[PDB]
Assembly symmetry: C3
Homo-oligomer: 68 residues x 3
């Protein structure tokens, strides 16, 4: 036990930052789509989903797990 608001203000930033990134990925994807299909990036897309999924879960296990 020690310092919790600073930990919640930091977590609240990561989350917001997570949203920011998802907007960029979208902006990037759409620009790619401009050429013709984004079939060459499955591994890029899958890589994105992989980490985003790990982060969302990392955030959720951090919010519901700290109440002391």
């Amino acid at each position: 036990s020690g310092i919790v608001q600073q930990q919640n203000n930091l977590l609240r930033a990561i989350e917001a930052q997570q949203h920011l990134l998802q907007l960029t990925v979208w902006g990037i994807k759409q620009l790619q789509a401009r050429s013709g299909g984004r079939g060459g990036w499955m591994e890029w897309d899958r890589e994105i989903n992989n980490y985003t999924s790990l982060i969302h879960s990392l955030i959720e296990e951090s919010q519901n797990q700290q109440e002391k």
Copy 2:
């Protein structure tokens, strides 16, 4: 009270990460501008500003509020 350097090293990362993102958003924006105007993304731009603004403020309220 407990562990502060690790909290400052993490905050210092979010901040730096904030800068990284703003460079990407710029890189993305300019590439969009290449076609012809970015008038269709106001909501995208506004969404960006919205979170970036929440994060900057979240960071500042975290720096000046922890001195114990």
Copy 3:
């Protein structure tokens, strides 16, 4: 001493987020390369390397420095 798992779950997010960003930067770079060379962005590239390098090091000094 106080709260460590929440600090490790947050650090684990920044790291994963670091990877996410590096994928976006790549996606952005390649799209730029499409036109013809990315020689005008050295300062953009150098700016990226600069912060990414500060973040990696900030993360590493945070992992090996907290064992209490």
